[PDB]
């Protein structure tokens, strides 16, 4: 009949007072329907509470095929209201190994690009390095090396070929009809471009210590007003730090002076004075071996 | 019109202003003063008087 | 105690815990008569104990009322008039 | 107990003889119910079934003082029969000296005043039973006066005797709250017993047969106790309505 809120309210006001926690077969399956009705209704609070209840009960119980595959789709659907790709990237780690063991490479290829698409949108964290190799990678495939290069793209990104790669290969990128909610494709260009700029300013601070603001706008794919916009956002959020001179138009790294000068930074020369006697001790022994033998 | 709330108007004026000033002070210094007034939303003379007061 | 004076204890404990927007704080101050913060803190603490029973981290209005009837009086020997003097 | 040897108020302000007086009332573990219709008053007591050496018909927890007047006693038996013969004496002597029908208000008040005389005599034991007197007044109509072992008497819309009185009052409180009256409908006294049995089973949580119960009926200028066959007819009459 086309009812959404009526089917959700009637099912929640009954099923909660229905089951006495006796038979967990039809109980777990029908609770998952309560979460699907809350997503179509648009209530994020109802889907969050239901996702924290039977999630741990399923893991403690023996593993089932049709039951565990439903959680993988539901944890992705909550990204519509949440709009956070860091949490949904960890939820796909189980389905990544599920299609690689129980299923075949037919279903393993699409889930490979979805977990990488959610990984490249993550703001920060050290888990991005451990997800480079993964498990089943190094299969010598076109879609495997394409998504794997996107993770390593954060190391060198000039944003010159960024619009070219997205328009050429766009399995999950520009047009994605699977595991992505939205009313149009406008969210693909906005969400992806804002994240790659955040990862751009991180590596540039570790490479160019002092750079002119005029030449900096070409490397970051930004204008004069857009350059200072992303710089001030990362500093306020506690990401990186840099030097921005408005009248001088010079961007520096702002090296910290808190290292106590020669008390710490100079201590890096201990390896210079230490290896002297190590090479002499090895040379005297080496010269006597070839001379006696 | 109230005299008691009048003493708290400058306190609330400086509270919302200080929160916006910390956003400018957090990154590196040496920015245009005319650009500072555009972020606050007031006149240049109005910002220079309140900013130097703190 | 006072109806408004006790609210300082209700509002302080509620700030350190998660509560639903439908929770009525005015129903506790009117019904409670001559009670201290130790009894009030046990009401909000029982609300979390009633919440973990239902596997719901967010305390709703139902968990607040069900926790009030248990912690309202700790004396088991009350009865009513059953034993005179 | 240095001060426990006697019956006085004790240094703690607590009577310890009343402590064991209420415990003796539940020694028999008998649950009774007393309700009042509009024109009638119907009481029901639980009749325990002993072994074959005893006659259940002779076992009665409800005594007849006079017409329209009845007494429901829950507690020790030896104190019930001695109080039953005493309650009848005041009923007949009052109809002689004052020449008037002794109401259940004074009948419970006389036992309350007589209860203090028992406490006043150190060699006499106070009544350890629960005296529940029911009747139909010419003016006030149906009235229930229950005399506690301590001498307290007060009117009751629907009373009970037993550990289940807490559950009995709860079910009967909402029943009288919706109708806003303390009397049961269906003024016919035969239909009043149907409700008295229905509300009692749901309150006690245990359904009983004709041999597990006894049903008294107090009408105007008439009183009688239903036999074993009359109680069975009440259960059949419930299904016909």
From Swiss-Prot, chain A:
Free-text description of this protein's post-translational modifications in UniProt: N-acetylated by NAT1.
GO CC aspect terms: COP9 signalosome; cytoplasm; proteasome complex; proteasome regulatory particle, lid subcomplex; proteasome storage granule
One GO process term, biological-process aspect: protein deneddylation
Domain PCI: residue ranges: 84-258
Keywords: Acetylation, Proteasome
Source taxon at top rank: Eukaryota
Protein family according to the UniProt entry: Belongs to the proteasome subunit p55 family.
Miscellaneous: Present with 5710 molecules/cell in log phase SD medium.
Function noted in UniProt: Acts as a regulatory subunit of the 26S proteasome which is involved in the ATP-dependent degradation of ubiquitinated proteins.
Protein name listed in UniProt: 26S proteasome regulatory subunit RPN5
Gene: RPN5
From Swiss-Prot, chain B:
Record-given protein name: 26S proteasome regulatory subunit RPN6
Family: Belongs to the proteasome subunit S9 family.
Described function: Component of the lid subcomplex of the 26S proteasome, a multiprotein complex involved in the ATP-dependent degradation of ubiquitinated proteins. In the complex, RPN6 is required for proteasome assembly.
Parent-protein residues present: 327 to 380 of 434
Miscellaneous comment text of the record: Present with 16800 molecules/cell in log phase SD medium.
Gene field: RPN6
PTM summary: N-acetylated by NAT1.
Organism lineage string: Eukaryota, Fungi, Dikarya, Ascomycota, Saccharomycotina
Organism (species): Saccharomyces cerevisiae (strain ATCC 204508 / S288c)
Subunit structure, interactors included: Component of the lid subcomplex of the 19S proteasome regulatory particle complex (also named PA700 complex). The 26S proteasome consists of a 20S proteasome core and two 19S regulatory subunits.
Curated annotation (Swiss-Prot), chain C:
Localization, UniProt: Cytoplasm; Nucleus
Posttranslational mods: N-acetylated by NAT3.
Family: Belongs to the AAA ATPase family.
Function as written in the Swiss-Prot or TrEMBL entry: The 26S proteasome is involved in the ATP-dependent degradation of ubiquitinated proteins. The regulatory (or ATPase) complex confers ATP dependency and substrate specificity to the 26S complex.
Name of the protein described by the UniProt record: 26S proteasome regulatory subunit 6B homolog
Species, as recorded: Saccharomyces cerevisiae (strain ATCC 204508 / S288c) (Baker's yeast)
Gene: RPT3
From Swiss-Prot, chain D:
Pfam annotation, one family: Proteasome
GO cellular component assignments: mitochondrion; nucleus; proteasome complex; proteasome core complex, alpha-subunit complex
Signal peptide coordinates: none
Cross-link Glycyl lysine isopeptide (Lys-Gly) (interchain with G-Cter in ubiquitin) per UniProt, renumbered positions: 222
Intracellular or extracellular location(s): Cytoplasm; Nucleus
GO biological process: proteasomal ubiquitin-independent protein catabolic process; proteasome-mediated ubiquitin-dependent protein catabolic process
Keyword Acetylation carried by entry: yes
Keywords for the protein's UniProt record, in alphabetical order: Acetylation, Cytoplasm, Isopeptide bond, Nucleus, Phosphoprotein, Proteasome, Ubl conjugation
Superkingdom as given in the UniProt entry: Eukaryota
Modification Phosphoserine occurs at: 227
InterPro entries membership: Ntn_hydrolases_N, Proteasome_alpha, Proteasome_alpha-type, Proteasome_asu_N, Proteasome_sua/b, Proteasome_subunit_alpha6
CDD domains: proteasome_alpha_type_6
Note: Present with 15200 molecules/cell in log phase SD medium.
Subunit structure and binding partners: The 26S proteasome consists of a 20S proteasome core and two 19S regulatory subunits. The 20S proteasome core is composed of 28 subunits that are arranged in four stacked rings, resulting in a barrel-shaped structure. The two end rings are each formed by seven alpha subunits, and the two central rings are each formed by seven beta subunits. The catalytic chamber with the active sites is on the inside of the barrel. Interacts with CIC1.
Family membership noted in the UniProt record: Belongs to the peptidase T1A family.
Protein name as it appears in the record: Proteasome subunit alpha type-1
UniProt organism field: Saccharomyces cerevisiae (strain ATCC 204508 / S288c) (Baker's yeast)
Species lineage: Eukaryota, Fungi, Dikarya, Ascomycota, Saccharomycotina
Gene symbol of the encoding locus: SCL1
């Amino acid at each position: 009949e086309g009812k959404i809120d009526e089917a959700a309210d009637i099912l929640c006001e009954l099923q909660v007072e229905t089951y006495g926690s006796m038979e967990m077969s039809e109980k777990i399956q029908f609770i998952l329907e309560q979460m699907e009705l809350s997503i179509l209704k648009g209530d994020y609070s109802q889907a969050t509470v239901l996702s924290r209840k039977i999630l741990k009960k399923t893991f403690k119980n023996p593993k089932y095929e049709s039951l565990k595959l439903e959680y993988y789709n539901l944890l992705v659907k909550i990204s519509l209201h949440k709009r956070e790709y860091l949490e949904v990237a960890q939820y796909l780690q189980e389905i990544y190994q599920t299609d690689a063991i129980k299923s075949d490479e037919a279903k393993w290829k699409p889930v490979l690009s979805h977990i990488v698409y959610f990984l490249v949108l993550s703001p920060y964290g050290n888990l991005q390095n451990d997800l480079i190799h993964k498990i089943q990678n190094d299969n010598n495939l076109k879609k495997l090396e394409s998504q794997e290069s996107l993770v390593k793209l954060f190391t060198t990104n000039e944003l010159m070929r960024w619009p070219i790669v997205q328009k050429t290969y766009e399995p999950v990128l520009n047009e994605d009809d699977l595991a992505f909610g939205g009313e149009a494709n406008k969210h693909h260009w906005e969400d992806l471009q804002k994240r790659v700029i955040e990862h751009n300013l991180r590596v540039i601070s570790e490479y160019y210590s002092r750079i002119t603001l005029l030449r900096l706008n070409e490397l970051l794919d930004l204008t004069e007003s857009q350059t200072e916009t992303y710089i001030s956002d990362l500093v306020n959020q506690g990401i990186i730090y840099a030097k921005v001179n408005r009248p001088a138009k010079i961007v520096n790294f702002e090296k910290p002076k808190n290292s106590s000068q020669l008390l710490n930074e100079w201590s890096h020369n201990v390896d210079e004075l230490l290896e002297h006697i190590e090479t002499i001790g090895h040379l005297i022994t080496k010269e006597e071996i070839m001379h006696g033998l | 019109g109230d005299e008691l709330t009048r003493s708290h108007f400058n306190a609330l004026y400086d509270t919302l202003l200080e929160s916006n000033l910390c956003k400018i002070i957090e990154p590196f210094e040496c920015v245009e003063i005319s650009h500072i007034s555009k972020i606050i939303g007031l006149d240049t003379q109005q910002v220079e008087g309140k900013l130097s007061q703190m | 105690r006072d109806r408004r004076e006790r609210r300082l204890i209700f509002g302080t404990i509620a700030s350190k815990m998660s509560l639903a927007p439908e929770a009525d704080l005015d129903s506790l101050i009117i019904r409670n008569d001559s009670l201290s913060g130790a009894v009030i803190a046990a009401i909000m603490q029982e609300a979390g104990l009633r919440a973990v029973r239902k596997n719901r981290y967010v305390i709703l209005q139902s968990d607040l009322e069900e926790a009030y009837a248990t912690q309202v009086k700790t004396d088991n020997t009350v009865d009513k008039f059953d034993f005179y003097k | 107990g240095y001060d426990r040897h006697i019956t006085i108020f004790s240094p703690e302000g607590r009577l310890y003889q009343v402590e064991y007086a209420f415990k003796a009332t539940n020694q028999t573990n008998i649950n009774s119910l007393a309700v009042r219709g509009k024109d009638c008053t119907v009481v029901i007591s639980q009749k325990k079934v002993p072994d074959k050496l005893l006659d259940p018909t002779t076992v009665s927890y409800i005594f007849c003082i006079s017409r329209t007047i009845g007494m429901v006693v829950n507690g020790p038996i030896p104190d019930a029969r001695n109080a039953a013969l005493r309650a009848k004496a005041e009923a007949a002597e009052f109809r002689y000296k004052y020449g008037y029908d002794m109401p259940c208000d004074v009948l419970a008040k006389r036992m309350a005043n007589l209860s203090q005389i028992y406490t006043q005599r150190a060699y006499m034991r106070p009544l350890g039973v629960i005296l529940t007197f029911v009747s139909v007044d010419e003016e006030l109509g149906p009235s229930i006066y229950k005399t506690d072992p301590a001498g307290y008497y007060v009117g009751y819309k629907a009373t009970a005797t037993g550990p289940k009185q807490q559950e009995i009052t709860t079910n009967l409180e909402n029943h009288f709250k919706k109708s806003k009256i303390d009397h049961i409908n269906e003024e016919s006294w035969e239909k009043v017993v149907e409700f008295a049995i229905t509300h009692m089973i749901d309150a006690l949580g245990t359904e009983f047969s004709k041999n597990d119960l006894e049903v008294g009926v107090a009408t105007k200028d008439k009183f009688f106790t239903l036999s074993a066959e009359n109680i069975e007819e009440r259960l059949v009459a419930i299904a016909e309505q």
